[PDB]
């Protein structure tokens, strides 16, 4: 298929370099274009620059000009963004984007698109999540249905993964986006609403997996009589 | 540098609805460098719109572009589930110094629903370990408006808790919100009374979750 391909998720120190990898195939890749854009959470598209394949010839926006290198190696295919002098401003999902090219000819537009590739820059070291449960009771049954949840508390970096029942259990899961807290860690709550009469037969179990610090927790979430 | 201007931030519309987007740019941007995109929560960007009225290869007729200058539109004639998303323009005048607008979500207007909400005390296992989080939840709620205040023995909390909330739904178009007050053990056990007080356009009266600590 069309398709242009990101490298993995980056964590970076203050003041370090970041090289992101882009992966052309099912196209002329020879005919087109790469630019990059990256994307904070909850703020607006930042265009870095862009790069034409056939000449290799390169722009940089004013903001990165004097810290970003846009290359391609034309026999793999394959664009790379690389970025010097990080700083925690720049933490975003970066993109790259391509013309769609069928032989010589192009499309107008940037119309295939990289999955993005999360960047995150901190001074934060690699720290596994305290996970503690969220137990159902009076205070968290409302009509016939329960809420239970667990709390995965001061982890770095991002993602923790939180599965319920081994993924057997999806319907009413709410796993919250992660807030960075003051201290340069991530907390989140995963929550599951279920019917108030499942609390007696139905086990509930939040499996959370953080790679970075090799943390596998299998939190068994108790019901409270009270 | 050009800056794009995107009005109105947030657009709530039935599906089968019209959905007019502007983008203003602070300087005369040419038909021909505007471009308009979609994007989707934890997707990368879509083109729709190129040269500020061509429609990119395959993009359904019911989205059209027009505008010149510093004032561009893009139109969904009858809105589609599927087209629900962010908007953004792009003027992408000359070599580089290109930039993109602040976006417009476009969000599915539904009845108004109000959350059911959960409180949860800090785990025996967390005060264990030197901190107090006090967890409230609101479940399945339209619109996305709501206030969640925090009052410890009936004093009115401030800059101890954080709101994360949930993409709109793609079935049921509601939202969930978790509010967590996050305190030292020492400070946790000098109170007795945690409420959580929402307030929502689906509640008459603002509905309060309470607990005395140590009781459950």
């Known amino acids: 298929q069309v398709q242009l391909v990101q490298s993995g998720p980056e964590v970076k120190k203050p003041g370090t370099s970041v090289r992101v990898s882009c992966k052309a195939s099912g196209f002329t890749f020879t005919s087109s274009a790469v630019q990059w854009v990256r994307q904070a959470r909850g703020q607006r598209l930042e265009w870095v620059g862009w790069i034409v394949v056939g000449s290799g010839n390169t722009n940089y926006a004013q903001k990165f000009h004097e810290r970003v290198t846009i290359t391609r190696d034309m026999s793999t295919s394959t664009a790379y963004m690389e970025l010097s002098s990080l700083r925690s401003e720049d933490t975003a999902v970066y993109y790259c984007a391509s013309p769609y090219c069928s032989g010589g000819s192009c499309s107008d537009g940037f119309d295939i698109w990289g999955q993005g590739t999360m960047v995150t820059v901190s001074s934060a070291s690699t720290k596994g999540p305290s996970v503690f449960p969220l137990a159902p009771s009076s205070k968290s049954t409302s009509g016939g249905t329960a809420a239970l949840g667990c709390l995965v508390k001061d982890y770095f970096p991002e993602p923790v993964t939180v599965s319920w029942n081994s993924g057997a259990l999806t319907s009413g899961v709410h796993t919250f986006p992660a807030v960075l807290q003051s201290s340069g860690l991530y907390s989140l709550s995963s929550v599951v609403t279920v019917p108030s009469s499942s609390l007696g037969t139905q086990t509930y179990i939040c499996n959370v997996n953080h790679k970075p610090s090799n943390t596998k927790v299998d939190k068994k979430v108790e019901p409270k009589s009270c | 540098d050009i800056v794009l201007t995107q009005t109105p931030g947030t657009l709530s519309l039935s599906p089968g609805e019209r959905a007019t987007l502007s983008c203003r740019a602070s300087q005369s941007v040419s038909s021909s460098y505007l471009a308009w995109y979609q994007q989707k929560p934890g997707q990368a960007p879509r083109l729709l719109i190129y040269?500020?009225?061509s429609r990119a290869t395959g993009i359904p007729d019911r989205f059209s572009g027009s505008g010149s200058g510093t004032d561009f539109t893009l139109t969904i004639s009858r809105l589609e589930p599927e087209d629900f998303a962010v908007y953004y323009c792009?003027?992408?005048?000359?070599?580089?110094?290109?930039?993109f607008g602040q976006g417009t979500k476009v969000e599915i207007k539904r009845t108004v629903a109000a959350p059911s909400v959960f409180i949860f005390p800090p785990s025996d296992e967390q005060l264990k370990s030197g901190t107090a989080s006090v967890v409230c939840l609101l479940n399945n709620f339209y619109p996305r408006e709501a206030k969640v205040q925090w009052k410890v023995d009936n004093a009115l909390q401030s800059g101890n808790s954080q709101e994360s909330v949930t993409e709109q739904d793609s079935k049921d178009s509601t939202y969930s919100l978790s509010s967590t007050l996050t305190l030292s053990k020492a400070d946790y056990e000098k109170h007795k009374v945690y409420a959580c007080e929402v307030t929502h356009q689906g509640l008459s009266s603002p509905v309060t979750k309470s607990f005395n600590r140590g009781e459950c």
């Open positions: 040269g500020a009225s």
């Open positions: 792009q003027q992408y005048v000359g070599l580089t110094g290109w930039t």
